Amino acid sequence: ALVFFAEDAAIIGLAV
Amino acid sequence: ALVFFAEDAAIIGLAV
Amino acid sequence: ALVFFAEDAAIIGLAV
Amino acid sequence: ALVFFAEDAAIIGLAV
Amino acid sequence: ALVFFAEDAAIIGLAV
Amino acid sequence: ALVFFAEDAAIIGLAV
Amino acid sequence: ALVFFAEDAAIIGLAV
Amino acid sequence: ALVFFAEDAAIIGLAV
Amino acid sequence: ALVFFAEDAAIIGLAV
Amino acid sequence: ALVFFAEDAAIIGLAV
Amino acid sequence: ALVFFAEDAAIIGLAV
Amino acid sequence: ALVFFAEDAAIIGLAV
Ligand SMILES: [Cl-]
Ligand SMILES: [Cl-]
Ligand SMILES: [Cl-]
Ligand code: NA
Ligand code: NA
């Protein structure tokens, strides 16, 4: 899978 | 909201 | 085009 | 994270 | 299929 | 434009 | 609703 | 940045 | 395949 | 149009 | 919910 | 990368 990063603060990984 | 980063060069934030 | 980064490990660029 | 709602009936949350 | 709700005004359902 | 709702907590509108 | 256009050749509309 | 076009009527640009 | 048009400026095709 | 296949259960076509 | 399929190799299901 | 499948007929892969 891929992990996209985003600022939610703190940086989080979104798994796809 | 989430901020996703992308390269456009410069890095930009895309807000959701 | 924009390039989104993702972890796949190595960081890769996804072009849009 | 964000939670988007949808009707599946019951309403469910989709998490991002 | 899922139905997502949106304001278009009236609330509509978008089917997927 | 369409407005999608999401829970961010508070409910927000995302404009498209 | 929105209509997005695309080339399929003919130009088509995608309704949302 | 990208701008996607759609018919909303009038044409609107959706900015990314 | 579909080609979606966007302003990137110049108007470009995004192929799917 | 493209047809994407997803499990909805049965595997169904989603038309784009 | 929907399950979308992708080749990752193995075929994986992505839940929505 | 992930490969998503679609019917275009041929079955094609869309790379992400
Ligand atoms: Cl996943
Ligand atoms: Cl592209
Ligand atoms: Cl369609
Ligand atoms: Na917010
Ligand atoms: Na860059």
XYZ file of N, CA and C and ligand atoms in Angstrom:
581
model
N 0.845 -1.200 0.000
C 0.000 0.000 0.000
C 0.870 1.236 0.000
N 0.178 2.393 -0.197
C 0.822 3.683 -0.173
C 0.451 4.332 1.148
N 1.313 5.204 1.630
C 0.972 6.062 2.754
C 1.100 7.526 2.327
N -0.018 8.244 2.291
C 0.027 9.670 1.992
C 0.194 10.453 3.291
N 0.928 11.564 3.267
C 1.079 12.349 4.484
C 0.212 13.644 4.401
N -0.278 14.068 5.560
C -1.064 15.279 5.661
C -0.840 15.917 7.007
N -1.036 17.227 7.077
C -1.086 17.932 8.359
C -2.530 17.927 8.890
N -2.741 17.369 10.082
C -4.078 17.316 10.682
C -4.093 18.087 11.989
N -0.732 21.511 14.985
C -1.234 20.182 14.532
C -0.075 19.135 14.482
N -0.321 17.987 13.767
C 0.670 16.925 13.644
C 0.588 16.303 12.263
N 1.709 15.768 11.797
C 1.742 15.073 10.517
C 1.281 13.622 10.694
N 0.276 13.238 9.914
C -0.315 11.901 9.977
C -0.140 11.168 8.644
N -0.159 9.847 8.684
C -0.086 9.038 7.483
C -1.459 8.503 7.162
N -1.864 8.593 5.900
C -3.124 8.003 5.468
C -2.847 6.822 4.509
N -3.227 5.613 4.936
C -2.978 4.462 4.284
C -3.811 4.081 3.257
N -3.398 3.781 2.025
C -4.217 3.332 0.892
C -3.534 2.111 0.302
N -9.176 20.976 9.705
C -9.064 20.480 8.310
C -7.695 19.823 8.089
N -7.618 19.001 6.999
C -6.380 18.337 6.622
C -5.657 19.275 5.678
N -4.326 19.264 5.718
C -3.549 19.918 4.667
C -2.648 18.883 4.006
N -2.834 18.691 2.703
C -2.028 17.752 1.916
C -0.949 18.574 1.226
N 0.291 18.088 1.170
C 1.342 18.827 0.475
C 1.569 18.243 -0.953
N 1.920 19.131 -1.878
C 2.283 18.739 -3.220
C 3.360 19.690 -3.702
N 4.145 19.233 -4.667
C 5.079 20.078 -5.388
C 4.383 20.644 -6.604
N 4.514 21.960 -6.794
C 3.902 22.656 -7.906
C 5.019 23.407 -8.603
N 10.165 24.831 -8.978
C 8.825 24.565 -8.355
C 8.828 24.941 -6.849
N 7.600 24.912 -6.237
C 7.398 25.200 -4.819
C 6.498 24.124 -4.217
N 6.566 23.950 -2.898
C 5.622 23.087 -2.187
C 4.424 23.907 -1.768
N 3.231 23.386 -2.035
C 1.990 24.065 -1.691
C 1.149 23.164 -0.802
N 0.276 23.770 -0.015
C -0.636 23.043 0.836
C -2.024 23.104 0.240
N -2.696 21.955 0.257
C -4.045 21.824 -0.275
C -4.972 21.470 0.890
N -5.899 22.374 1.225
C -6.642 22.265 2.323
C -7.866 21.646 2.177
N -8.239 20.712 3.053
C -9.550 20.026 3.040
C -10.045 19.969 4.485
N 2.177 19.980 -13.965
C 1.393 19.072 -13.071
C 1.904 19.099 -11.649
N 0.998 18.703 -10.699
C 1.331 18.617 -9.312
C 1.991 17.280 -9.084
N 2.830 17.207 -8.060
C 3.418 15.944 -7.673
C 3.124 15.766 -6.213
N 2.354 14.728 -5.929
C 2.037 14.381 -4.541
C 3.040 13.359 -4.050
N 3.543 13.492 -2.828
C 4.478 12.493 -2.326
C 3.740 11.426 -1.499
N 4.248 10.204 -1.586
C 3.729 9.099 -0.813
C 4.852 8.140 -0.475
N 4.688 7.446 0.636
C 5.583 6.360 0.980
C 5.090 5.080 0.323
N 6.004 4.387 -0.347
C 5.698 3.120 -1.017
C 6.756 2.099 -0.626
N 11.093 0.938 2.494
C 10.282 1.662 1.472
C 10.998 2.941 1.015
N 10.408 3.592 -0.042
C 10.953 4.818 -0.600
C 9.823 5.811 -0.761
N 10.162 7.095 -0.813
C 9.177 8.117 -1.095
C 9.068 8.202 -2.594
N 7.834 8.225 -3.100
C 7.614 8.371 -4.533
C 6.730 9.572 -4.795
N 6.754 10.014 -6.044
C 5.949 11.132 -6.507
C 4.846 10.636 -7.430
N 3.635 11.096 -7.160
C 2.478 10.821 -7.997
C 2.074 12.072 -8.767
N 2.153 12.017 -10.100
C 1.880 13.074 -10.894
C 0.556 13.285 -11.266
N -0.039 14.471 -11.150
C -1.389 14.896 -11.549
C -1.212 16.213 -12.317
N -8.831 13.670 12.289
C -9.296 13.275 10.938
C -10.702 13.827 10.658
N -11.121 13.691 9.365
C -12.447 14.099 8.927
C -13.280 12.838 8.920
N -14.580 12.987 9.148
C -15.506 11.891 8.933
C -16.576 12.361 7.974
N -16.687 11.670 6.841
C -17.704 11.956 5.850
C -18.868 11.001 6.066
N -20.111 11.442 5.885
C -21.230 10.545 6.146
C -21.860 10.039 4.828
N -22.407 8.826 4.872
C -23.087 8.248 3.731
C -24.172 7.324 4.193
N -25.188 7.167 3.374
C -26.220 6.195 3.660
C -25.867 4.879 2.986
N -25.804 3.810 3.783
C -25.472 2.471 3.289
C -26.666 1.564 3.573
N -31.684 1.058 5.552
C -30.238 1.375 5.543
C -29.841 2.152 6.806
N -28.491 2.289 7.008
C -27.949 3.026 8.138
C -26.962 4.063 7.626
N -26.756 5.128 8.397
C -25.755 6.130 8.078
C -24.435 5.647 8.609
N -23.401 5.654 7.763
C -22.057 5.289 8.187
C -21.111 6.468 8.064
N -20.009 6.405 8.804
C -18.949 7.380 8.723
C -17.753 6.808 8.000
N -17.230 7.604 7.076
C -15.993 7.274 6.373
C -14.887 8.211 6.834
N -13.840 7.628 7.425
C -12.876 8.328 7.995
C -11.769 8.615 7.244
N -11.263 9.842 7.176
C -10.060 10.321 6.483
C -9.243 11.163 7.471
N -25.396 0.258 -3.173
C -24.593 1.476 -3.438
C -24.795 2.451 -2.299
N -23.730 3.273 -2.049
C -23.707 4.305 -1.021
C -24.406 5.529 -1.576
N -25.024 6.316 -0.699
C -25.576 7.616 -1.078
C -24.904 8.663 -0.201
N -24.159 9.568 -0.832
C -23.554 10.703 -0.136
C -24.496 11.903 -0.199
N -24.623 12.657 0.885
C -25.533 13.803 0.869
C -24.730 15.109 0.673
N -25.343 16.012 -0.078
C -24.769 17.303 -0.358
C -25.853 18.342 -0.480
N -25.512 19.581 -0.149
C -26.396 20.703 -0.398
C -26.168 21.240 -1.814
N -27.227 21.305 -2.615
C -27.149 21.854 -3.979
C -28.111 23.020 -4.138
N -31.590 26.381 -1.937
C -30.955 25.083 -2.305
C -31.620 23.922 -1.533
N -31.374 22.669 -2.027
C -31.938 21.480 -1.412
C -30.828 20.484 -1.117
N -31.085 19.569 -0.191
C -30.180 18.456 0.038
C -30.438 17.399 -1.019
N -29.384 16.972 -1.704
C -29.482 15.884 -2.663
C -28.627 14.659 -2.252
N -28.893 13.525 -2.890
C -28.131 12.309 -2.669
C -27.343 11.995 -3.916
N -26.079 11.663 -3.731
C -25.235 11.235 -4.826
C -24.892 9.748 -4.686
N -25.297 8.943 -5.667
C -25.137 7.606 -5.612
C -23.982 7.004 -6.068
N -23.279 6.132 -5.327
C -22.106 5.399 -5.798
C -22.313 3.924 -5.431
N -22.549 25.815 -6.583
C -21.624 24.774 -6.099
C -22.316 23.838 -5.108
N -21.749 22.598 -5.002
C -22.240 21.602 -4.059
C -21.565 21.876 -2.729
N -22.227 21.542 -1.631
C -21.572 21.618 -0.340
C -21.729 20.287 0.329
N -20.593 19.649 0.580
C -20.532 18.376 1.278
C -20.303 18.602 2.749
N -20.988 17.858 3.613
C -20.752 18.037 5.030
C -19.800 16.936 5.551
N -19.034 17.316 6.554
C -18.173 16.387 7.225
C -18.026 16.809 8.661
N -17.709 15.836 9.496
C -17.341 16.109 10.873
C -15.841 16.315 10.972
N -15.450 17.475 11.490
C -14.038 17.800 11.680
C -13.785 17.965 13.167
N -15.664 17.820 18.176
C -15.554 18.177 16.739
C -16.787 18.988 16.271
N -16.639 19.670 15.087
C -17.718 20.481 14.529
C -18.058 19.987 13.134
N -19.293 20.219 12.698
C -19.662 19.908 11.331
C -19.258 21.080 10.435
N -18.533 20.783 9.360
C -18.113 21.806 8.411
C -18.675 21.513 7.025
N -18.751 22.546 6.193
C -19.121 22.400 4.800
C -17.896 22.499 3.902
N -17.817 21.609 2.920
C -16.736 21.600 1.931
C -17.310 21.922 0.565
N -16.893 23.065 0.015
C -17.418 23.544 -1.092
C -16.849 23.118 -2.261
N -17.603 22.671 -3.263
C -17.183 22.221 -4.590
C -18.090 22.882 -5.630
N -26.691 20.337 -10.027
C -25.506 19.462 -10.113
C -24.451 20.079 -11.033
N -23.195 19.581 -10.866
C -22.076 20.005 -11.681
C -22.027 19.085 -12.894
N -21.477 19.570 -13.999
C -21.174 18.690 -15.117
C -19.712 18.884 -15.436
N -18.948 17.810 -15.312
C -17.532 17.801 -15.691
C -17.413 17.327 -17.114
N -16.502 17.904 -17.889
C -16.372 17.485 -19.278
C -15.119 16.592 -19.452
N -15.195 15.744 -20.467
C -14.070 14.903 -20.824
C -14.172 14.565 -22.281
N -13.044 14.227 -22.895
C -13.049 13.766 -24.261
C -13.037 12.255 -24.258
N -13.969 11.690 -25.012
C -14.104 10.246 -25.161
C -13.862 9.851 -26.613
N -13.225 11.080 -31.583
C -13.706 11.169 -30.180
C -14.716 12.319 -30.014
N -15.558 12.203 -28.938
C -16.573 13.202 -28.646
C -16.361 13.775 -27.259
N -16.883 14.971 -27.028
C -16.843 15.566 -25.699
C -18.065 15.081 -24.950
N -17.873 14.561 -23.734
C -18.991 14.062 -22.941
C -19.094 14.795 -21.610
N -20.275 14.730 -21.002
C -20.503 15.314 -19.696
C -20.641 14.244 -18.632
N -20.063 14.524 -17.477
C -20.165 13.633 -16.319
C -20.871 14.385 -15.192
N -22.073 13.935 -14.838
C -22.849 14.567 -13.962
C -22.686 14.281 -12.631
N -22.540 15.284 -11.763
C -22.415 15.110 -10.313
C -23.332 16.096 -9.602
N -0.812 25.649 -9.912
C -2.041 24.944 -9.423
C -2.839 24.534 -10.614
N -3.666 23.462 -10.418
C -4.564 23.008 -11.467
C -5.865 23.770 -11.284
N -6.591 23.975 -12.373
C -7.994 24.395 -12.306
C -8.803 23.431 -13.187
N -9.757 22.739 -12.565
C -10.658 21.857 -13.297
C -11.931 22.628 -13.644
N -12.462 22.471 -14.857
C -13.668 23.198 -15.213
C -14.917 22.284 -15.142
N -16.021 22.930 -14.801
C -17.293 22.273 -14.761
C -18.367 23.284 -15.037
N -19.470 22.795 -15.564
C -20.677 23.599 -15.736
C -21.494 23.512 -14.458
N -21.837 24.671 -13.900
C -22.638 24.757 -12.675
C -23.915 25.543 -12.965
N -26.927 28.061 -16.816
C -25.749 27.788 -15.926
C -24.492 28.533 -16.408
N -23.382 28.398 -15.606
C -22.105 29.049 -15.908
C -20.937 28.098 -15.676
N -19.804 28.358 -16.322
C -18.596 27.574 -16.082
C -17.878 28.105 -14.862
N -17.462 27.182 -13.999
C -16.696 27.505 -12.821
C -15.402 26.744 -12.867
N -14.413 27.285 -12.173
C -13.123 26.664 -12.067
C -12.998 26.163 -10.663
N -12.604 24.907 -10.560
C -12.334 24.279 -9.274
C -10.819 24.169 -9.080
N -10.283 24.951 -8.145
C -8.965 25.050 -7.946
C -8.306 24.119 -7.188
N -7.215 23.484 -7.615
C -6.384 22.542 -6.864
C -4.919 22.924 -7.101
N -10.114 5.218 -23.410
C -9.741 6.038 -22.224
C -10.377 7.427 -22.328
N -10.549 8.086 -21.144
C -11.085 9.438 -21.117
C -9.923 10.401 -21.019
N -10.089 11.593 -21.584
C -9.162 12.682 -21.323
C -9.899 13.826 -20.659
N -9.452 14.150 -19.448
C -9.992 15.267 -18.701
C -9.146 16.492 -18.941
N -9.759 17.651 -19.196
C -8.971 18.852 -19.384
C -8.953 19.713 -18.103
N -7.782 20.268 -17.858
C -7.518 21.162 -16.763
C -6.538 22.232 -17.197
N -6.649 23.387 -16.562
C -5.634 24.428 -16.648
C -4.520 24.039 -15.681
N -3.293 23.959 -16.182
C -2.118 23.714 -15.350
C -1.222 24.950 -15.440
N -0.228 29.701 -17.458
C -0.646 28.275 -17.428
C -1.075 27.827 -18.811
N -1.308 26.491 -18.939
C -1.737 25.929 -20.188
C -2.842 24.914 -19.943
N -3.710 24.738 -20.908
C -4.734 23.705 -20.817
C -4.117 22.390 -21.205
N -4.169 21.402 -20.295
C -3.618 20.097 -20.556
C -4.658 18.970 -20.427
N -4.353 17.809 -21.014
C -5.185 16.618 -20.905
C -4.646 15.680 -19.848
N -5.548 15.166 -19.020
C -5.225 14.139 -18.037
C -5.890 12.850 -18.462
N -5.090 11.858 -18.868
C -5.571 10.710 -19.365
C -5.893 9.699 -18.495
N -7.101 9.136 -18.564
C -7.527 8.016 -17.725
C -8.145 6.942 -18.626
N -17.805 5.230 -22.044
C -17.340 5.447 -20.661
C -16.572 4.235 -20.119
N -15.756 4.500 -19.051
C -15.001 3.476 -18.361
C -15.975 2.797 -17.427
N -15.708 1.541 -17.099
C -16.472 0.874 -16.033
C -15.504 0.368 -14.995
N -15.685 0.817 -13.758
C -14.848 0.346 -12.649
C -15.598 -0.740 -11.891
N -14.936 -1.827 -11.468
C -15.661 -2.903 -10.773
C -15.359 -2.854 -9.262
N -16.406 -2.957 -8.467
C -16.254 -2.935 -7.023
C -17.283 -3.864 -6.405
N -16.945 -4.447 -5.267
C -17.908 -5.241 -4.515
C -18.869 -4.301 -3.813
N -20.169 -4.498 -4.017
C -21.218 -3.731 -3.332
C -22.042 -4.723 -2.545
N -23.204 -9.514 -0.931
C -22.712 -8.485 -1.895
C -22.373 -9.118 -3.259
N -22.329 -8.235 -4.304
C -22.015 -8.634 -5.656
C -20.995 -7.659 -6.187
N -20.248 -8.093 -7.190
C -19.292 -7.232 -7.874
C -19.995 -6.493 -8.990
N -20.085 -5.166 -8.901
C -20.874 -4.377 -9.842
C -20.032 -3.389 -10.605
N -20.525 -2.942 -11.756
C -19.819 -1.937 -12.523
C -20.263 -0.535 -12.123
N -19.283 0.337 -11.948
C -19.501 1.757 -11.714
C -19.038 2.519 -12.957
N -19.959 3.201 -13.628
C -19.712 3.836 -14.778
C -19.227 5.129 -14.756
N -18.147 5.467 -15.460
C -17.590 6.823 -15.526
C -17.404 7.159 -17.006
N -21.143 -1.346 2.335
C -19.906 -0.673 1.926
C -19.461 -1.249 0.602
N -18.572 -0.457 -0.052
C -17.987 -0.845 -1.293
C -16.599 -1.369 -0.990
N -16.154 -2.298 -1.797
C -14.745 -2.714 -1.760
C -14.218 -2.551 -3.155
N -13.206 -1.704 -3.299
C -12.526 -1.518 -4.538
C -11.290 -2.400 -4.637
N -10.978 -2.883 -5.834
C -9.855 -3.810 -5.970
C -8.643 -3.160 -6.679
N -7.455 -3.605 -6.290
C -6.212 -3.162 -6.902
C -5.172 -4.235 -6.786
N -4.261 -4.230 -7.744
C -3.069 -5.062 -7.682
C -2.008 -4.313 -6.910
N -1.488 -4.962 -5.878
C -0.401 -4.410 -5.083
C 0.822 -5.337 -5.138
N 3.045 -9.900 -6.546
C 1.983 -8.959 -6.113
C 0.711 -9.719 -5.798
N -0.222 -9.010 -5.098
C -1.479 -9.601 -4.722
C -2.579 -8.610 -4.995
N -3.768 -9.126 -5.266
C -4.963 -8.302 -5.360
C -5.431 -7.993 -3.939
N -5.679 -6.704 -3.691
C -6.134 -6.219 -2.396
C -7.495 -5.535 -2.555
N -8.239 -5.500 -1.458
C -9.522 -4.831 -1.404
C -9.410 -3.645 -0.499
N -9.853 -2.508 -1.005
C -9.876 -1.249 -0.305
C -11.324 -0.889 0.038
N -11.622 -0.826 1.337
C -12.890 -0.616 1.799
C -13.366 0.678 1.901
N -14.600 0.966 1.456
C -15.239 2.288 1.587
C -16.704 2.029 1.935
N 3.746 0.784 -6.930
C 2.464 1.462 -7.148
C 1.329 0.465 -7.174
N 0.104 1.007 -6.922
C -1.119 0.224 -6.978
C -1.586 0.255 -8.412
N -2.228 -0.808 -8.880
C -2.843 -0.780 -10.219
C -4.314 -1.051 -10.031
N -5.139 -0.074 -10.401
C -6.588 -0.237 -10.368
C -7.093 -0.690 -11.718
N -8.143 -1.500 -11.770
C -8.574 -2.057 -13.038
C -9.891 -1.407 -13.531
N -10.019 -1.280 -14.844
C -11.230 -0.758 -15.439
C -11.461 -1.421 -16.772
N -12.726 -1.474 -17.149
C -13.132 -1.900 -18.470
C -13.242 -0.689 -19.376
N -12.512 -0.745 -20.497
C -12.492 0.297 -21.510
C -12.922 -0.357 -22.830
N -14.381 -4.800 -25.509
C -13.601 -3.884 -24.617
C -12.402 -4.616 -23.992
N -11.447 -3.806 -23.454
C -10.275 -4.348 -22.822
C -10.370 -4.067 -21.341
N -9.700 -4.878 -20.534
C -9.512 -4.536 -19.137
C -8.157 -3.889 -19.028
N -8.123 -2.665 -18.503
C -6.881 -1.907 -18.456
C -6.507 -1.617 -17.022
N -5.240 -1.296 -16.831
C -4.732 -0.911 -15.535
C -4.457 0.566 -15.445
N -4.787 1.124 -14.285
C -4.542 2.534 -13.970
C -3.631 2.610 -12.766
N -2.448 3.160 -12.984
C -1.484 3.176 -12.070
C -1.457 4.223 -11.192
N -1.302 3.983 -9.893
C -1.186 4.970 -8.847
C 0.003 4.524 -7.993
Cl -6.145 0.516 3.150
Cl -1.031 13.386 -15.510
Cl -21.317 8.853 -16.475
Na -12.399 23.023 10.071
Na 9.345 19.327 -5.201
